[model samples]
Every structure is written in structure tokens, then in C-alpha cells.
Target: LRDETPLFHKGEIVLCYEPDKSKARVLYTSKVLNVFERRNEHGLRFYEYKIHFQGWRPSYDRAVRATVLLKDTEENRQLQRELAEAAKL
Candidate 1:
């Protein structure tokens, strides 16, 4: 935890929420490709994480907000499986 400001680092594996229209909200295991951060006039630090979805096409790779991602964890792994199962039908 060198710099707590950036919770994640480049090349880190994380989970991302890719919004779905006319379908269930989908999440994917993603890799952090890049990071952009800055402090706003309001003194709020904003982060934009660039990510690439595992096994997905390059067109799907894009930058997203911090709220859309979370560090990879066992609990999140289970959550991903649960969602996949729920959408399997």
C-alpha cells in the first residue's frame, strides 16, 4: 500500500462492470492497462482506469471510472460465478 490514493496499479487484475442494455449487468475479469488521475478544483481525486477484458475483443477495451471496478478477490470470484450461473439460463 505505497500510495493509498491509487487503489490499483498497472497490470493488476481486477473486476469490472460492463453495463448491459436489454440484458443483465455483466462483469468481467479485466487487466489494468493504464491509469489516469487528478485532483479536481473541489479537492476530490478522480481516477480513470483503462482496462482490457480477458478473452474479449480489442474493441471492448476502454477506460472506465473507479466505481466500475474492484480488486480481484475470492469473494468477488464467487460473485462472478453466481452471476454467470444466474445468466446462464
Candidate 2:
């Protein structure tokens, strides 16, 4: 639970988990493809998302659990815009 309130939306760019060769955790920019609710067997509700890396391989696409996705800050937003622009090239 990164935040008490929902912090992600479709089409938003966010930081998600990626693995490095050294087995260290890495964060990479990902585009939110979808957001939807799900109910667990315990009757608890949570969100899940389908995401893909901008301009990266389609094989990178995957579903992400709420806890691993991070919100974009002002600076992160700006950088995401740049990344989006670069993706068009």
C-alpha cells in the first residue's frame, strides 16, 4: 500500500519493477494499459494493472500488482514526457 488513495490511472507513466543482471532490483518506466478492481478470496479488494514499457519490447508487457507501482512526481512527469517524445522517434 504505497498510498491510502488510488494513485494510478490508465495511460499514466509510472515506475515499476525490473530485474538487473546482478539480481539487483531496478525501476523502469511503464505505461499503464489498464486498471481494474479485483477481489481476493478473503473478500479484500485491490487494484491491478496491465502495463508495458514505452518503446520497449512487447515481451516486457505484464500485469503489475498495486504495491509495486510507484507514483510519478513532478520531475518524473517531465521525464516521462521526454520519454514519450523519444518513443515517437
Candidate 3:
């Protein structure tokens, strides 16, 4: 959280390394519903994004870590395609 100030905000959309539909982590499109910080066992603080998956049930909406979240970019989209291709088969 170099931006310990917060890299994401309400209403901003991001990609989540989610495996909601498959057995492997899939980069899914999502929109930020809220933002919060959580500390690890070492007490290191970082951002957690609460997001709703695009075209998905809100029931699955939840906070996710930056390790799995990604900014929207052409490269990320390609990454998603690669991930999904791997997971689907």
C-alpha cells in the first residue's frame, strides 16, 4: 500500500484473480464496492478491495487482496485470456 493512502476507491473497477467459476484462479472483471485495510500476521498493512464481479451474483461479493487484484489494462486482459484458457481445459 505505497499509496497507503489507497490505490482503489468506491466505484472504481478492477480485475480479481477469482476462481468463482472454475477450479483455477481466473481473472474476472469486477467493480469496487468499497475499500479497507487489513494487517497480516506480521502486522504489515495493505489494501483490500471489496468488489462485485461483473455479471455475477452479489452473493459472492467480498473483499480480496492486492496479490490477486489487478488494474484494468490491455496486458491484464491478455493475462485473463491466458488464465481462463488454462483453467478451462
In order, candidate lDDTs are: 0.82, 0.73, 0.81
Error of 2 at 58 (Å): 2.6
Error of 2 at 46 (Å): 1.2
On lDDT, the candidate that comes out on top is: 1
Q: What TM-score do all the candidates reach, one by one? A: 0.81, 0.67, 0.75
- Which pairs clash in the backbone of model 1? none
lDDT of 3 by residue, 37-88 (tens): 8776676777878899999899989887666778888999899999899887
Model 3, position 71: C-alpha lDDT score = 86
Q: Order of candidates by TM-score, top first?
A: 1, 3, 2
Report the lDDT tens digits of candidate 2 across residue range 1-89: 23234568999988875533553444677899998787667766777889998889989888878777777777755655665566556
Off by over 4 Å in 2: 1-5, 19-22, 74-89
Model 1: per-residue Cα lDDT over 1-89, one tens digit each: 12226778899999987666676666799999999986777767777788999999879899987777877999888888887787877
* Segments in model 1 whose C-alpha atoms lie over 4 Å from true places: 1-4, 41-43
RMSD of 2: 6.5
